Every structure is written in C-alpha cells, then in structure tokens.
Design a protein around this ligand. Sequence first.
Ligand code: ZN
Lengths: 341, 75
Amino acid sequence: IPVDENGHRYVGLVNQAMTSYLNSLVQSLYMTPEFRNAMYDWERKKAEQSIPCQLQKLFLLLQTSENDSLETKDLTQSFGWTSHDVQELCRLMFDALEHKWKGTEHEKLIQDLYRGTMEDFVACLKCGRESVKTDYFLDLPLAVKPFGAIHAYKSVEEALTAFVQPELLDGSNQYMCENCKSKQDAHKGLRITQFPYLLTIQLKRFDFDYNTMHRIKLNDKMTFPDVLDLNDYVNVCVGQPIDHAAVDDIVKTSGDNVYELFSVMVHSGNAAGGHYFAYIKNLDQDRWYVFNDTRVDFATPLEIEKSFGGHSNTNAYMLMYRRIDPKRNARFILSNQLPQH
Amino acid sequence: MQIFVKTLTGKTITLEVEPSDTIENVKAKIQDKEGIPPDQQRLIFAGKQLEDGRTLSDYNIQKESTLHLVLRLRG
Ligand SMILES: [Zn+2]
C-alpha cells in the first residue's frame, strides 16, 4: 500500500482531457524537496488566477488530502486555458514564480536550484585564437541519434561526452574570425564549468523526417544509472536497487560532483501524441514509486530498466537528478510545522 | 551578426542575422538550413526560451552566441 513518509496515502491527479504531462510535471516538482519546501515558505475581487497560489494549493492537497485523486482544473484556469508541451509548461510555471518572487528572498531561487554554468569556445584554426564566452543552461538537451549514425548512443554518459565534444565547423558554416578578416575553419564546442544543484536532463527521442515532414519517436536503447558521476566533465551496470552510502564515499573521494536520480519522465504511445507518466523516487524514503495519472503504485527496478529501449514502446525522455551534498540535501517538511492553514 | 545554433542532431550550424531581426526571422532561417517548420521550433538561450515577436536585442543575444533548438512534444 503506497504511503508517504508522514504516513499519508499517496494521491494521484485526474487526467482531464489529455494532460498527463501536466500530472507528471507536478508530481515531479511536488516531489522535489527544496522546491516543495520553497512553496510552503511562500506567503472585492480575489485573484485565484495566481499560478503560485494554485500550485501551492495543489501541493498542499497532494500532501494532506485523504482523497482518491486531485483535479488540476484550478491550475489550468490559473494558466488561462480553455481546452502545449511539458517544457513550455515548466517555463510558464517557473517564470510566473520568478515574477512573483521579485523582491522576495526567493528571487534567485530557480537560478540556484536549476541553473548551470558552461562556456562556449570558438577557436579559429588559421589565427589560432580562441574566443570564450560564458553561457548558462536550465535543462540539458542530449541527442540520441546523431543522424546519420548507424549506432545510436547506448548510454547517457556517452551522450554527455558527445555534447561537450569539440566539433569542427564545415565550409558551409565557417567562423567569421575578426583577426583573420575572412571566413575560416574553426573548432566549435561547449564545456561545462559547473553543474546545477537540481540536474534536469532531457533526451531527444523525438526527431523530424525530411521526406514525410512528420515527427517520429526514436525508441533506441539508452541507459542511465541511479548514481551519476560527472567529475570528468568539469576541468553493463545496474543502479536501480537502493543506494549505498559507502559507494558514494568511494566516488566522493576522487570527485565532488555526484548526483542521484529521483524522477524518470517516460512517454508511451504514438510519436505525435501519446501518454506520459513518471517513475518518481522519494528522496527521504529511498523507494521507487510509479505515478501514472490517478493511479499511484510501487515501482520495481525491472520496469524502470525495461524502459531504456528495445522493441507499448515506452521509453524515458527526461530525467531528474539532485546533487549529493549531506548538508544541502533537504527533507520534506512535516505537516505539523507549517504556519499556513 | 553571425550566431551559432546547435540543431537536433547536435551538429552546430551558423546563421547570419541582424540584432534588429525578430526571432521569427531567425526561426525562418532555421527552416532554410534544416527543413524544420517554425511552428515546431523552440529556441533556448542561457536557459531562457525565446518567445515570438521579441528581437535578438531583447534577449541581449550578441555575436557568436549559441542557441539551442529542441522540438515541441505533444500528447
Ligand atoms: Zn583567426
């Protein structure tokens, strides 16, 4: 029987029309300890339309309501909708929170939690001069099939290395070096200088076809572990069972950037339009659950691994990690200490 | 004047644009370079998504900047 850490029965979300991605995004955010606790710290006509207020109400009901399922109609009304992806949805919620939190202590909270830091370099080969500029990133889009590649990347780490791989600019796309005073061959590339606290990584499983002009889904196999070591990026294996603090220390010693998987956004069905659900892990309970619209159940490591790929062709398209820091990693606020009633 | 775009495959291409050009013209040049409809394009710069109607100066996109192209998922 699914139970939360405070002994509360897990609650699903009603699938009104086709909005399974909304449920998966809310259950992921509501699962994020720092993001949920942030929500509780936040404080004639009445403005129900406030996306922060409705998101706060939905989190409160998701935690302290003895009901079968919760309706996201109020949250959709806050958006201003009458009958559209998940990333654009996440941008609308975050920007509405950032706008409401201006002047508040939580003004730069989405930055401190989800923003990463990298640098883009362009090195002209004739001059031998490199131009580096600082750039940030919220999510991390990784490619699956670098077409035409006969073999797609088998693991997330291999996609990460290819993302930070210096690529050569061809004659059609040559770099305009000012010192060269002409178009020139150059090395283009990106390298990560810092990872965000809450690592949001996206898999490019949806590709486009030239002849038919119809999008298609790439069900190629891509693996990801529960523990992620990313210390080599800043200058068969199974991890779905419960974690170990000792293996964390042995990798901690040779590197300080280790992350823990806690949310697995998967998609099943047709490429143009299908169904979305998520395998979510309680960071305080150390247990894997499955959130699928109104139905919330336990999750076995087998069905989480079975979604890597290989042919209803259900595969994960977005993964959520959190940095393993013993002091910064927070826990969900118990219901009793809330000063909001 | 010349900015980079990391397409869906990951291979980065170049584009010639004016700072006064709107983002819709930029997504139109992505169509000429990649054959991808502009309705399906979603451009991300410095983690912030670029919205239609705003120029490149609104986002302070300078020369040699790198935009990220991703597809809109549906369902
Ligand atoms: Zn040069």
